Amino acid sequence: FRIAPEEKVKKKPSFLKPWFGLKYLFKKPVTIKIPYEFIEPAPRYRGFHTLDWKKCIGCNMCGQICPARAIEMTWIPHPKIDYGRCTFCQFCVDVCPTGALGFIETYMLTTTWREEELLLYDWVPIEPEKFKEIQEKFKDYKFPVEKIEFNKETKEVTYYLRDGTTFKFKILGYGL
Amino acid sequence: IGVFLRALLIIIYATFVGFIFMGIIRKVTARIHRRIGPPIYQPIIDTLKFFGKKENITHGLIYDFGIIYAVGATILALMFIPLGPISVLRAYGDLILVTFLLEIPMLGIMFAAMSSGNPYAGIGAQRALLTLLAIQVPLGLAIIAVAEYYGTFSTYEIVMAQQKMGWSIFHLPLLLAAIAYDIVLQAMFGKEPFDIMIAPGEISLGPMVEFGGKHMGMLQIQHAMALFAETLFFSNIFLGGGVPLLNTLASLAVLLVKQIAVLLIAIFVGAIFPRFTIDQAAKFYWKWPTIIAAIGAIMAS
Amino acid sequence: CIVCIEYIIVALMIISAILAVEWRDLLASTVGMAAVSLFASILFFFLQAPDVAMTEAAIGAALSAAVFIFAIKRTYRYETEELGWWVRW
Amino acid sequence: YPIDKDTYELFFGPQHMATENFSIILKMDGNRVVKAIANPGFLHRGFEKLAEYRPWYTNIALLLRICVPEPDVPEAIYSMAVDEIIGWEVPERAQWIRTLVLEMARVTAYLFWIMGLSFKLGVYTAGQWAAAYRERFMALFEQLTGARVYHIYTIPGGVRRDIPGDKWLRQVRDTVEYLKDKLKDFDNVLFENYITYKRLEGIGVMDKKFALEEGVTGPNLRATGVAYDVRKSDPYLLYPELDFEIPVLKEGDALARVLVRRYELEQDLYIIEQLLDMGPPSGPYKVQDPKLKNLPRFKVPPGEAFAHVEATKGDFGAYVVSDGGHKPYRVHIRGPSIAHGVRVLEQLLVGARLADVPAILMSLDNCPPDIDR
Amino acid sequence: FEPLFNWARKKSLWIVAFCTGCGGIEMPPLMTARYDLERFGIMPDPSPRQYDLFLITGYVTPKTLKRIIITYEMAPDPKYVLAHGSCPINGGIYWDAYNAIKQLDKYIPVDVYIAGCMPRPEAVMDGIKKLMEMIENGEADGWKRYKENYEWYRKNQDELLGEGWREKEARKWIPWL
Numbered sequence A: 001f002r003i004a005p006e007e008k009v010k011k012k013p014s015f016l017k018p019w020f021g022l023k024y025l026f027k028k029p030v031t032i033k034i035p036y037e038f039i040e041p042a043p044r045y046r047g048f049h050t051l052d053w054k055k056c057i058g059c060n061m062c063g064q065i066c067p068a069r070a071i072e073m074t075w076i077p078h079p080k081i082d083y084g085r086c087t088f089c090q091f092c093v094d095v096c097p098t099g100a101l102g103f104i105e106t107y108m109l110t111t112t113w114r115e116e117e118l119l120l121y122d123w124v125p126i127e128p129e130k131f132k133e134i135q136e137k138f139k140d141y142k143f144p145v146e147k148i149e150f151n152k153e154t155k156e157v158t159y160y161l162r163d164g165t166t167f168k169f170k171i172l173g174y175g176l
Numbered sequence B: 001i002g003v004f005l006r007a008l009l010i011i012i013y014a015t016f017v018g019f020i021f022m023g024i025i026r027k028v029t030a031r032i033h034r035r036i037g038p039p040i041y042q043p044i045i046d047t048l049k050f051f052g053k054k055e056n057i058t059h060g061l062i063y064d065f066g067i068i069y070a071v072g073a074t075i076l077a078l079m080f081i082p083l084g085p086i087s088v089l090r091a092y093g094d095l096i097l098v099t100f101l102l103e104i105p106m107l108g109i110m111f112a113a114m115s116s117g118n119p120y121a122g123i124g125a126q127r128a129l130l131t132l133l134a135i136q137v138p139l140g141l142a143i144i145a146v147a148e149y150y151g152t153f154s155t156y157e158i159v160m161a162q163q164k165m166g167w168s169i170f171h172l173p174l175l176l177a178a179i180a181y182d183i184v185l186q187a188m189f190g191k192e193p194f195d196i197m198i199a200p201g202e203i204s205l206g207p208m209v210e211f212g213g214k215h216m217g218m219l220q221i222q223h224a225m226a227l228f229a230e231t232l233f234f235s236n237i238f239l240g241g242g243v244p245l246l247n248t249l250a251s252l253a254v255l256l257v258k259q260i261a262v263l264l265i266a267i268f269v270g271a272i273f274p275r276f277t278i279d280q281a282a283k284f285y286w287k288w289p290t291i292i293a294a295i296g297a298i299m300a301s
Numbered sequence C: 001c002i003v004c005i006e007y008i009i010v011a012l013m014i015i016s017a018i019l020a021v022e023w024r025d026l027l028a029s030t031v032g033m034a035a036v037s038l039f040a041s042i043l044f045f046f047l048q049a050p051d052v053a054m055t056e057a058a059i060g061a062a063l064s065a066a067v068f069i070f071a072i073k074r075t076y077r078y079e080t081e082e083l084g085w086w087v088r089w
Numbered sequence D: 001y002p003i004d005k006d007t008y009e010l011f012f013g014p015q016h017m018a019t020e021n022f023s024i025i026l027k028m029d030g031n032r033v034v035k036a037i038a039n040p041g042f043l044h045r046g047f048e049k050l051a052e053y054r055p056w057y058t059n060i061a062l063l064l065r066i067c068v069p070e071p072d073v074p075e076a077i078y079s080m081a082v083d084e085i086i087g088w089e090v091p092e093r094a095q096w097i098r099t100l101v102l103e104m105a106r107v108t109a110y111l112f113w114i115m116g117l118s119f120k121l122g123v124y125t126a127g128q129w130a131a132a133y134r135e136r137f138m139a140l141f142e143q144l145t146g147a148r149v150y151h152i153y154t155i156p157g158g159v160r161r162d163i164p165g166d167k168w169l170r171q172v173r174d175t176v177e178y179l180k181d182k183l184k185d186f187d188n189v190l191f192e193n194y195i196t197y198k199r200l201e202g203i204g205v206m207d208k209k210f211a212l213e214e215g216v217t218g219p220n221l222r223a224t225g226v227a228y229d230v231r232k233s234d235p236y237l238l239y240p241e242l243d244f245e246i247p248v249l250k251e252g253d254a255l256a257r258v259l260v261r262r263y264e265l266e267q268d269l270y271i272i273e274q275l276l277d278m279g280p281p282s283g284p285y286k287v288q289d290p291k292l293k294n295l296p297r298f299k300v301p302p303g304e305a306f307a308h309v310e311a312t313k314g315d316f317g318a319y320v321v322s323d324g325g326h327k328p329y330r331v332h333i334r335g336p337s338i339a340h341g342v343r344v345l346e347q348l349l350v351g352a353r354l355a356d357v358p359a360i361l362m363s364l365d366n367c368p369p370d371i372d373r
Numbered sequence E: 001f002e003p004l005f006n007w008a009r010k011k012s013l014w015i016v017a018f019c020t021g022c023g024g025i026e027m028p029p030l031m032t033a034r035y036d037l038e039r040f041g042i043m044p045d046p047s048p049r050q051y052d053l054f055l056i057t058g059y060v061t062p063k064t065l066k067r068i069i070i071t072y073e074m075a076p077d078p079k080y081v082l083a084h085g086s087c088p089i090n091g092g093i094y095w096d097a098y099n100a101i102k103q104l105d106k107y108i109p110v111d112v113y114i115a116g117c118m119p120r121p122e123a124v125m126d127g128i129k130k131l132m133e134m135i136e137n138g139e140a141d142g143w144k145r146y147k148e149n150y151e152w153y154r155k156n157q158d159e160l161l162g163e164g165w166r167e168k169e170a171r172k173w174i175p176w177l
């Protein structure tokens, strides 16, 4: 049914026809010089999380649809998303009933080998005033938490932001 | 003591222009498929990186001496070809000497690639040696076509016979040797149509599949000198540079322009053409460039 | 002086020549073209030929420069060299 | 003591840049092959006993990574299968969206196969161009749904994000007309030179009776004499109102299985140009409001469903069985390359030279995340 | 003596193209005509000696952690791996895998992690740019922890899959010739 050729697809080999791949010796080379020409990603690129602390009800509806089992719950009962095991699939956004789990375009996040820079991946996500860390503070599209000082027995994590509030809160207990 | 400093001048200039020529090859192959690519001073930083390790390999007592002999042979290759008027010797720069002393780098970069012991190095040496077998059938006929058209062999009595009268890519019995050299140069270099003594991707890397820090640095020096020696041998025979410091520096500059000239046509062929099976590479250098150089050899006689 | 103002005029013509092609704004290029016609008219007059000086005055000042911006009226004004998703392609 | 003394066993493991991630142990005889068995499974994540523990809706995002070059064909088959066991009413708009993303991911996978072929066939210019023109398709997907690859888009009913509008639909017309004017510069570097035609001639001769009964389902048995296109035989998405023409040759050497994929690229780009001038009418992107809420607790009535869909390398099926709860009882994703470069590759390398072990490896489009599952 | 080589390292990082499974779809177009790496001098070549920038692109099967650590044993001085994706950090979505190796720092010394699934090439650019900033002064990275702190990694290597892989993954074919 609707066989296209009889010998129409098969072409003839040729000696010096590859010189027509040499046409781009003079056109402008199609690259982006990343230091420093920025790219401006999409208006709804899937990125990091921007939980609102006043609409969260702690119903753990997100807990049961995370494909990678990292939206585990804390008490003061909001979730901490860790990006250790998270695929940015954003199934926790359209399943959260109240609407208190958004996503904004922020993907650049580079941390080093030491553990003190690796506590950076355990953050209770902050309010959407972090959109004033995507704009109005040097639009670099990077994770605006940038160090976390956990403390054993005095459990008070400190999201030392770019220049804003240190955002102290206590964490006691996990799960339900 | 003055010929020693002059030879040191030639080897250090051949270093600091051969690496820039390989960087120019990388720049043109970058622009040939729409990319900025590296800076011009790129493979200098390759060599400068590869002498800054803290471990090496040294599989054997011969694993060192083969590539060191390759570097010594490729320095001996460029010492006789008349790099402008400044030559450490111009009495004896015979055709057979320089032609055979391009092949001896393809020994020592492979003779010490065997001492490691690898099926990848073994089949790289297997696919490198059929080139050096096959390429000397149109190469010898090009040398005979240069020979019987002039008669003299001392290469100072060839650039003199060019700057006296005529160019050398003209006079069609000698131009048919140049097309044979233009085809054999991509194999003698290691550029993409006749690539297979490098072969990045099909086999792992062939002969230089596992060398290490210092050995790859000596290879980059040897590869840049193989570039410069075979290109200067093509230009001081088929083109002729020949020719006070404002005369000498401009002589070497127009020699550098004719170095880039065949190097420019070595790249345009050497990116739009895929890699060649070695069974066809043995079959190709007997069909077309052999009969071209043979017609040139019977028209030079 | 004699030759110093000549060197001043000729280097001013050169710096209004180089900066006539470095700009992207084409109205600015007409400005640079008019300044080149200025220094050409002054150099014609200083080289003591007034016929060519007044002819180039009536030609290059507002019949070659004022015909060119007259042509960029219904055309571009920038180089338009462009940030972007599908850009510089 | 080396106990073979006759046949040296070089083998292209993972770190080789010709084979991607599956080791083929080759019992080489000088420069030919006399026995070529393969050891796949350097990538066995597991998806039988791993996708059995997630709920029905969230088992999309975990199931994307079964095939890397096409980041939409694995989700659009599971979304077609859970469509069947529940029996939705997926509207015209969701059908059109899933159609166009299923064809633009296919031209992305063809472009990636061209770039992957040229990185191991020496010529880099056809590789750099192919990846450059794949990047604008990635940057066009990013407007629509999410990331570059692994865009978790097609949930079991409908899609997740609709079109932006005339900023997007005009843009696809621009890049498709651009690449249809661009495709005549891929022929001169990859399919018109007398190197490639003299390099891939007569290697890996696949017979006519050796393709249909072997496990081969892709476009590469279509270069042998076989009339089977799953888009043409049983159209599933908005395929019947397209009228494309499929290629079939009577050959079966390796370059027959490359020209057919080039012609498939040409006619598939003609499909995307033909689909766009239709344009989607109105409708919702979701399917139903009441039978979707409490998204984890998604009890599906029991039964089973099979679906299968055309890919860049092999018509590869899914097999979902539903016990009756919020867990797929077994979701089997049949990889396209299970007997398509593992078993048929064993009787294809016997006699072939070493230079045409990587080219044969890419003339079947071997993707190592499909053998393991 | 020392800064004559230190600037030379951060300009010609040769990457080895392992292409570790899922993730070899943003390893090539990272190094092609678009958003590129040869402008940084990152020229790929498939050799376990002529490299000093290993990209563990995503997950690691223990039938590949043998091959990765054998490749990692051969780069002489300046080997430092750049972990990728979100697999090496804590395990990706395959934390429910008997195969896919969680917590990559317990096996080979990771220098720098990126996030993303898949990580966009701009994030890889940020990762390499932070790796350049780290390698300017020189910051006690990997190859300096795999040497003195070998007693911990060799114990953690041998505990998972262990017992001398050079006899288990070598004798696994000589009966099946």
Ligand code: SF4
Residues within 6 Å of the ligand: A065, A066, A067, A068, A069, A070, A071, A081, A085, A086, A087, A088, A089, A090, A091, A092, A093
């Ligand atoms: S970001 Fe995605 S993977 Fe992570 S918890 Fe939310 S829905 Fe799950």
Ligand code: SF4
Residues within 6 Å of the ligand: A055, A056, A057, A058, A059, A060, A061, A062, A063, A077, A078, A079, A095, A096, A097, A098, A099, A100, A101
């Ligand atoms: S985001 Fe939604 S599911 Fe998660 S705690 Fe808040 S209300 Fe519950």
Ligand code: SF4
Residues within 6 Å of the ligand: A087, D065, E022, E023, E057, E058, E059, E084, E085, E086, E087, E088, E092, E093, E094, E116, E117, E118
């Ligand atoms: S990090 Fe994400 S994309 Fe990369 S291998 Fe892991 S699950 Fe796959």
